[PDB]
Scaffold this active site. Sequence first.
Site, mmCIF file in Angstrom:
data_model
loop_
_atom_site.group_PDB
_atom_site.id
_atom_site.type_symbol
_atom_site.label_atom_id
_atom_site.label_comp_id
_atom_site.label_asym_id
_atom_site.label_seq_id
_atom_site.Cartn_x
_atom_site.Cartn_y
_atom_site.Cartn_z
ATOM 1 N N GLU D 159 -34.534 3.137 -27.748
ATOM 2 C CA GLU D 159 -33.454 3.249 -28.740
ATOM 3 C C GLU D 159 -32.738 4.613 -28.808
ATOM 4 O OE1 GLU D 159 -34.895 1.521 -32.517
ATOM 5 O OE2 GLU D 159 -35.131 -0.447 -31.587
ATOM 6 N N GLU D 277 -37.860 -5.856 -27.528
ATOM 7 C CA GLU D 277 -38.458 -6.049 -28.853
ATOM 8 C C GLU D 277 -37.670 -7.099 -29.589
ATOM 9 O OE1 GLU D 277 -38.559 -2.439 -31.150
ATOM 10 O OE2 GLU D 277 -39.047 -1.178 -29.399
#
EC number: 3.2.1.37
Lengths: 501, 501, 501, 501
Positions: D159, D277
């Site tokens: 991220e 995810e």
Amino acid sequence: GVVNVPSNGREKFKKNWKFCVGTGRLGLALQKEYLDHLKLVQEKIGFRYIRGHGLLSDDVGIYREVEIDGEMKPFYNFTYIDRIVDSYLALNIRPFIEFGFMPKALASGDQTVFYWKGNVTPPKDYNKWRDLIVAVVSHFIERYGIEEVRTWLFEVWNEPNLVNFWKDANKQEYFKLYEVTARAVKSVDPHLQVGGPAICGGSDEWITDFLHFCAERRVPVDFVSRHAYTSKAPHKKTFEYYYQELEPPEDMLEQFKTVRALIRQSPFPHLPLHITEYNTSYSPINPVHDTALNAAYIARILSEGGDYVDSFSYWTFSDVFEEMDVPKALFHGGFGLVALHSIPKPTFHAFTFFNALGDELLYRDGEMIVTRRKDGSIAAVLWNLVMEKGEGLTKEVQLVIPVSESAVFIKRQIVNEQYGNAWRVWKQMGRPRFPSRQAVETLRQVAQPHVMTEQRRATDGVIHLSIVLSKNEVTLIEIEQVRDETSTYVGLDDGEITSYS
Amino acid sequence: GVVNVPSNGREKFKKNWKFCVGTGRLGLALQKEYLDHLKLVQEKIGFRYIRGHGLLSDDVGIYREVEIDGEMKPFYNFTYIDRIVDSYLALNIRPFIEFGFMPKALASGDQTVFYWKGNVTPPKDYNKWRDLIVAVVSHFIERYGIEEVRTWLFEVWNEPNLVNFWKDANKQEYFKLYEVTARAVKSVDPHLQVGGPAICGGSDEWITDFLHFCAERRVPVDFVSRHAYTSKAPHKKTFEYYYQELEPPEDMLEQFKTVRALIRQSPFPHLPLHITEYNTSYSPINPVHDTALNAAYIARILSEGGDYVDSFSYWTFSDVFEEMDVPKALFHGGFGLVALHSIPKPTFHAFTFFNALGDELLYRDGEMIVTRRKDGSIAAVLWNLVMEKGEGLTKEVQLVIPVSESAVFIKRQIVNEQYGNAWRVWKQMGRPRFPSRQAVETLRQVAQPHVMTEQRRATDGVIHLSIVLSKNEVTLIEIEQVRDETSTYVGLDDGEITSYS
Amino acid sequence: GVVNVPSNGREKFKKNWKFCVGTGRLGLALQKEYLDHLKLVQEKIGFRYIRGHGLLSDDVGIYREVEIDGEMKPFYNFTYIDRIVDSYLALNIRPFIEFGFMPKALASGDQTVFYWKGNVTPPKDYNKWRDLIVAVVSHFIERYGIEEVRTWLFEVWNEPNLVNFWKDANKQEYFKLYEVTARAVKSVDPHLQVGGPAICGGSDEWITDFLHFCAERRVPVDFVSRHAYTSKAPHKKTFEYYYQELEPPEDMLEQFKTVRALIRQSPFPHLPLHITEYNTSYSPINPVHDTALNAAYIARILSEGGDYVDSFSYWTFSDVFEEMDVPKALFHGGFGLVALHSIPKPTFHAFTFFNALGDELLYRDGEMIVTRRKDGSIAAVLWNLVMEKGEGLTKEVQLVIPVSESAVFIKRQIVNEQYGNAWRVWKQMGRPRFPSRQAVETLRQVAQPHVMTEQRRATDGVIHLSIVLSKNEVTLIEIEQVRDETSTYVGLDDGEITSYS
Amino acid sequence: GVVNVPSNGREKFKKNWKFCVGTGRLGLALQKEYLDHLKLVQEKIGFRYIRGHGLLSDDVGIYREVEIDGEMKPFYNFTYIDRIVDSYLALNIRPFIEFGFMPKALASGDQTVFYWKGNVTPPKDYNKWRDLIVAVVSHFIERYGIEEVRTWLFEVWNEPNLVNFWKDANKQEYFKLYEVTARAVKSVDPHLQVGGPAICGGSDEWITDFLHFCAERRVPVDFVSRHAYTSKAPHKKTFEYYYQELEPPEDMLEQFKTVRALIRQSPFPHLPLHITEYNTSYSPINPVHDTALNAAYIARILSEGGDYVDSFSYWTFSDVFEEMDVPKALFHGGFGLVALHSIPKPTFHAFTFFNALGDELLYRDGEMIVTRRKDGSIAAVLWNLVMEKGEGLTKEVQLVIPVSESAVFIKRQIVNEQYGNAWRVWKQMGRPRFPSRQAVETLRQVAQPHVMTEQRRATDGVIHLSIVLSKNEVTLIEIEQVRDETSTYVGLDDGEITSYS
Ligand SMILES: [Ca+2]
Ligand SMILES: [Ca+2]
Ligand SMILES: [Ca+2]
């Protein structure tokens, strides 16, 4: 003698040596002890198939009758073999099925064999037998699927050329039995591999006559089986032992080679040859089986056997066995590689040692085999068979070995009269028939091979190994590259440790 | 010298030597590797207690705050010690609890110790520290029961006499920390055994003063704890290692014997003494730990240490340890009896050999201990500790052992520079830092004691053993009654087997 | 109606009900399947002793004759019971030894019993029988230690009042067999508890005559053994079943009570009474054994039987059995608590539910037992036995139980015609005789009890349970202390989670 | 809704749903608890790959310096990941490697993320970071061999579009780090699959920009990775919880589909998409994870997610996790399919149910998926996601299924608010933070799905099933052929068993 190992080799050492292993009767596979030994054998050697008697005998209990209204009717009880074959597949081993012996309710006469009384008469009604075969093979396919069962093998009966295993040793009745079995098996599924005639030695005209019976009458045959031992008749028996003299190992190799020639002349020259039993002695109460000599002897057969035959099956993997009643002591002359309490005999270690060999053959003579593995490492097994009495009788071997890798780590494992020999130490204990837990653990520690290791720096791209093998030694030697990481440990000085330099 | 072993003995060899063993920090007990090691240690050596740092440190994570309704309030998180202490009791070992280090949210200052950063400063609030002790002890009682917890021991802090473990090595601050902790524990239940001062060597007046502190203020105290090592501070360092010279084992035994005397002269003359740490070197990166010297050295201590103390706890059972960061190679000079991949180091076999001794002490000098078990068998550990450099330095020993038992089976296991020694073989492999699975299995195999067995008959009620011990060898000799069953094997003759007589 | 459970109970519910459990013949203990079954049974139910036939029978193979120096001499082969009794002790169970049946080589005649042909004739030489008893008991002491063996029990023979088990049901000759056996056991060690006469029902004068025999000839007797069943003789047969009608459970309890009174009038009024066999049907092929009805029936016996006898041994722990040949389908009417593939039958849950009961008996009637545990929790077992045909037939029960808590957690487990019942689901599957692995796993899943849980707050110090039990349901209710920690979860609101309140 | 299920389907239901699963940081894989969970998950759901953070973080310990002479020099400690990756492979799962976070000794600054403080700053020197990737990837090849390592995947960072995970959310700086890493990996071996940019949602321009950067500058990309959740920022927090509103499942599928369209328009149109995810809430302390709603929500995703992406990795397999400190209660809002103590959550059962599906797809809508398997049986998973509050809300579903098989066995397994739900019962126990062993075993039992079975007869070639689903239920329905064997049980009559008809 000085042996010069070539860098590479043309020929490939085969896995024929571990294709199959023998067992006591299938009903004994229900024993936890049996499965204990089989798990050990599948971890350290890993055989593909397993072969024994009694699939259709009454302890496993498949064939019954069964009174309905007023008449006897067949009932097929698969409770026990379902568990047995399940337990096999769970340990990565498949049945080399042997159809036999005769169920009581199907038998024509009273003659039996063994302490466990396998019936050895022909079936009263050949159509009932056919139906039994179809029921059994059909069930196997129902349970395990057609793809699985197509990989199995199906031998018909056992040693029909001996009067103890088949009534009157009737050649023609056996051929009738063979044809009924063979055709019943193909009728379920045509790919299934059926074969025979499962004969003991001394009578190989049976293999010629068998293959001619099948040619003349268009009867299916997918393999030939024969058995091979090197022991003579007992010269001394006690209440618990047979003692027997042995022919040397080349006698067995000649047997293999002779039977392969008889196939090559037959009308079915392409048939595989499966030696579904072999050992030195054919008696389960001959102490020779528990000795270092047995291992050194079998090592020779493991080295060469596969040149002539597609498989040869060591009778047996385990002392879990009752052909001549329950073992009367720990080391009692049983066939097994593995003694009761999962204690490895010297012969087990010979298999284990062969299981470290690579596919690439560098050198082979009558006392050693030298291989290369994929990683580049060498693995050799050497043996010193001495069939004569006396002590000392050592053998020196001088191995000049080609290797580019500047340093080498050598790991040798040995089993002989001193090491990896629970039989020797069991004598020291006083030959306890039924030893304690603690005596058994001690026997298990002693049964492990003696390990010695060394590092050796190469000179001129070649290492010299002087190898002393004592009487009836079998030894594995692995030679690996040293990628020395020492220089990464900057400052390292063992001399800075108390007592060391 | 000829050693005459008396047939009977008055003295009793105590089990003090395995009351307690040391460990890396309790957060590491969550690792699978840790638990494999403890399972092996508990099966081969039955330790009763396990002692290590970090119960209250933050990886275990018991002490937190926690903002509730505009207020910073304590939260006690027992997720991790529940799992840890559960795993201990399942392996039949109880915690010798050590209260430390300082939770970060309760620390008064910044100073830490070790790569894992245990905080070594007083609590900012002593009432919050006490509340912590009460909530933890209470938790143990709620979970496991009062009877269980009452068999545990509670040591307060670690080496307060060292600046590395305690801000300024503040004596009176430690006595105060002890006092608040000792009263906290007793207020939950008065039968919980609490003690201190957990000091390293070098300043034993701390014991004298500690007990005078507890006497004057009537602070509860139930044992004295002390650590004991024989290594000088390091004289050489690499990025990887601390190297240290060692004093002889008599130095450690004299430390034990000195601290016992100091308790006897004190106002608590009857207090038990727990040496909650011991080894040769106190550094977790000193290679001496991996060697055969360590094993012989410690066998001296196992033989006599129980003469002076109630327990002496080997630091540690396992290389699962992070005080000086993750291990950088397989043999890296860690404290443990067991190395990564559950490989026994030579000292492990010293503990294992002592575990074979009987209660009845027949003989003992500075190089052996001979004992009788309940079944009348004899069991001796001999060591040949050589701290000086050089090759050979072997010691012959002559034994005259009485046994009315007219024939005897002798089992000997040896670990020295050549056998039972993974370190030696690791070096021959080129000191691989992170070895392959194959190399680990070979190091495991080589790590097993070498075994020799013989049968011997008694002349005149006595056996004479001539034994040779190489450099830094430890060896276990067991001598059992042979109840010979050979006569029941009527007509047995090994000479009827090929090659045997 | 309504049941007011008292808060305190005078009486103790005894552990008599799990003192002993029955087994198929000892030679079967060698099966893996047998040992998987024992492990399951020993983990979920605490059984102390294990009682079965065949110890001296020829599969286990102890008694042999052997020709030595031109005579027939005894050889005792302990290979198999060593392994069997070893595996019992490793699973925390000990033998309730039963001396039988007659070894073939020692039999005086040819009459046998069962598919496995145990010989049921007297010994041809009583002095040899005696020497056999002595050699076996002595071997036990040698292997296991005298203290271990003294905790065992020793039954002489089996159902000598039945012609199938003993030639002519010869009363006087059984008494002779008892005396020779009992005096041989005592000759080895006097603490060894021996007894009989191990009779089936229908002729209880045999107990009176057996005890008068032992009184008049001063023969050692330490207990009276007896078998209890409620099944009439089979009124229908198929090739694989016996179907039988049953008397109610009070018939068995009356059998227990009536035998106890006979001991109390005889010259040995204090002797222990061990019911070494009990079940509804005495046939290993009566399907009643696989049903919820069996569990409902036997729960009533578990609840009360201890009132009359020191032990009552459910025949058997496992469908691993061969009296009437190998099981011909998964659920075949076997005696076992556990079915092949380790599937628990309903009866197994009855035992598991009784294993959760506490010491303190608060209340008991003919359909429930309510107890208090050491921690203050309540455990109750309720059954709705319904022997008559039809659907519905519920019992509503109301329980007013006191508790010293304020909030309670109620865990209920249930086994009945619908849940925890693999026989019903096996039927739905088409009654596969030899089911696949996939089917077996489904059957295991469905064999698990159904669980319902609830929280309930008290009023006036008390809890009002309304309970509906379906036809032939057995059910466990545990009522425990709730220590609500919800208030520590400050701000918790399930109503903030998507979809909840 | 009456659904007519076709006999054959043209499409295949893909296995993309179990290609990968998420995990807590790689250092936690050292925990025994972690491996207990992984084993269970791998037994019941066999995932192919496992994806998590912290490979290069300092707990795993790979990167160090290391003073030699007087310079700091690189040292790569492989001790821990060797153990981690070995344990992964022994459980048949391969690493989906994520290179991160930043080793402290390489960090440019001090900013960290999580309780465990992974460093989220660029390397001070990109040549040192390159040298790290080469050493790590090379060591993997050395240990596991090049063929194995080529089957793995290599994602760069986590991220980087989020300021918490990467300094300043610096777009250009991540692309630089991707380029150095990607080129590093390719320089070891060109077939190793590397990719990125591992972004969280809310800024999909990053994917466009990443791919244009890779095209212009000819940087290796082999796949795209992206994370997907549907939880809004928290509306209420407590000291231990985040509570968040959820968008419906259509929002996630639409996220998948959106990103797939961006790739299809990019300069690399054919790139695999892996969602590394995914879950409802992105917070490891949101109770929604522990619920039946979570399970019913995730099922729609499992059913359809594979339409748009090559994998989607449920974050996570297990509550063994420390991003926001150690779990403060048993059910604490953790990501895991598996709660601590190996208790399966409702979501675990969704995956198990999907793992029973066949490959051939018969019928699919937004509330069910119906499949046929190799043997001809039908497997269906149905769910009733209700996101609003309120009780009841049941969904009736009518299946009309074709089978000529005469009759059928239906096995149904349900997890909903009442059954298969340990969270519900944990509340009934008073929400114990740290429950006893006994309360844990109860929660395990209660956590097992509810099973119902029935036999249904085929009327007119079709079976009509009526299935009532309760709120937030997911349920598995297997429909198999009944091969009825009842007629072989000649004479069988259940009416001959007490109470039965
Ligand atoms: Ca540590
Ligand atoms: Ca039986
Ligand atoms: Ca984590």
